[PDB]
Amino acid sequence: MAIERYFIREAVREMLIDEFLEKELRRAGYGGLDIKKTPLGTKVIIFAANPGYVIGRGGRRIRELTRILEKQFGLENPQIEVEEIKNPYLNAKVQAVRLAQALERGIHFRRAAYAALRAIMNNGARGVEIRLSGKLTGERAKSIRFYQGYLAKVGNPAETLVSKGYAQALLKLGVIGVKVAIMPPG
Amino acid sequence: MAKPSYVKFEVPKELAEKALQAVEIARDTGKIRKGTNETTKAVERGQAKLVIIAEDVDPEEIVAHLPPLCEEKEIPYIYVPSKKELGAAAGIEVAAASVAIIEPGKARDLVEEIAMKVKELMK
Amino acid sequence: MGQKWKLYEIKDGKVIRKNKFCPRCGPGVFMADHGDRWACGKCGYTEWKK
Amino acid sequence: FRYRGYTLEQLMNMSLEELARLFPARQRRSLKRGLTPEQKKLLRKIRLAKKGKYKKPIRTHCRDMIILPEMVGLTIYVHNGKEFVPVEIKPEMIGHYLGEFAPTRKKVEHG
Amino acid sequence: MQKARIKIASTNVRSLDEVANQIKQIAERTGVRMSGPIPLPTKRIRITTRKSPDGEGSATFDRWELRVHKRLIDIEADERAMRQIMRIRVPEDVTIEIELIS
């Protein structure tokens, strides 16, 4: 159409592929998608803590990811690349997806909180927060707030500097919302 | 075709398997007929080389006239003891209480051997 | 499904076809002969008797 | 002028085009653009009733048809939404909607 | 020779200026006469939206900006002197249009 619409079209294109791939690549450890868009073959760069899951169990998942990409888009030769995230513990969205699995697993609240806090502070976190809104295994709507170091400030040069990762860790009695807000040194 | 009561000549358990398998290559290389109402036309015009007829057709309408007519056309007939045993054999994995192989294709060394061995004994 | 559908008649060493063959399209398609009104078989066409 | 139009009969012989100059802006439009494939099966059941093959008592969900001169005489069954309410069609009904005559609510007092 | 227009827009400020500056620096020295990188408007796009999904009480309402900025460049060079200058990396996310007339 014009200049204005196309940019928004592209950005809408980012979401439909970033939404699905997160939900699948929770086994890998999803952290991002650097999407390079061309008329030759859409080049998606999937970010994982671990590349050995994304490839698959023998080529299946990388081909599966090549095959659903043809359906959504009109570039029918989309490449796949796996780049590692360089600090997955500096990435919050990784820690949210990583914490979600552990609560899916059944490990206790403050324990499942402590380790997490401790692995990213070791990594280099000026400050960190984990919040867990949910049932908290009764039937009252209370969140538990695990707190160390600095935090998100005021305004918006608040939220740009910090990291923020959200994940619904499913249970079979209810649900628990996993928020992980990291503050990197800066 | 036949009934479970027509035993005029013997069909060994070694000659009925080769005729379940010389009808399976017959459909995946050449042409095959199946469904008894289209087969009751292919033995009679003279488009069938060797008829193979399953022993479970009853009501009789295409079962009273075809044991005495097929000895007059110069064509041998051979028994499978079921519709589900001639169906899997037909090419496909679904019934076929009668079949007519129009054209052997890659069954041709096996469909000239079984059609003289049954014609030797009794058609 | 719907048995029985053996409507093709039998000669002694030949076959003959009971029903009519269409005159709009070519041979290979039989007519549900109503006596005045012809249905079609391949697809489903309103045809009148010629 | 008693009987609406020139005379009841001459508007059965003027049907396409010549009626139009007489009619409202709204009745013109739906004749001129045409009406739906359920309005084509309703031109067999007014025709089975005036002559020929065993007549059905004409029923309709047609509430967007505007009454013509040929259809004057038949007893038309217009579904109010629950049930069929009859209307004996007159020549004074040329130029009005068919969904006017059958109800769109049950008629009682308010309170 | 063939007067080309590079019409280059971008959704963000930092990405558009670096390319406009680099395009005026590399083209400067070769067989190119180049007219300066002119800024046209920001067709700032306002999406003005209801926050609350209840639509209830007072609902505070988001103002949205999408700002798309357009630099324009005339150039006198060949179609071969054009690709040499279009070598550049370019931010994600920067649209570069090319009209060709004599």
Next chain:
Amino acid sequence: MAKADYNKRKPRKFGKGARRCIRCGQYGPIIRIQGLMLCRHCFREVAPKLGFRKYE
């Protein structure tokens, strides 16, 4: 018995019932038509990845 297919077959030429989103699959709920058909509620969640800015 026997019958022919259905997957809906009525008019839906235009209006709200014509539209659906590409995230929560609705007719009557919001459809922002700029080539970004979503509801207002999705819009809010999605935008920081889009590159829209909260600031007025």
Next chain:
RNA sequence: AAUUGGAUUCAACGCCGGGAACCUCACCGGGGGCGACGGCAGGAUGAAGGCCAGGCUGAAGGUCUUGCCGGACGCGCCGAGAGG
């Protein structure tokens, strides 16, 4: 006949509705209709799908009477799905 539902003091009442003539739509009236995957018995001795023509339907082989094709696999329940 149904006037779909929810919201209810501030903080429910231009509210969910940033779009109710059909659509939407969840309500009502009437006509018509899909139930996975396994088990069980059935199969091609021709459709599970299509179809003139009346008789019926507000219309739809939809339904019956009625006659039939293209090429070949699916009820009824019982666990238990998709859908809401």
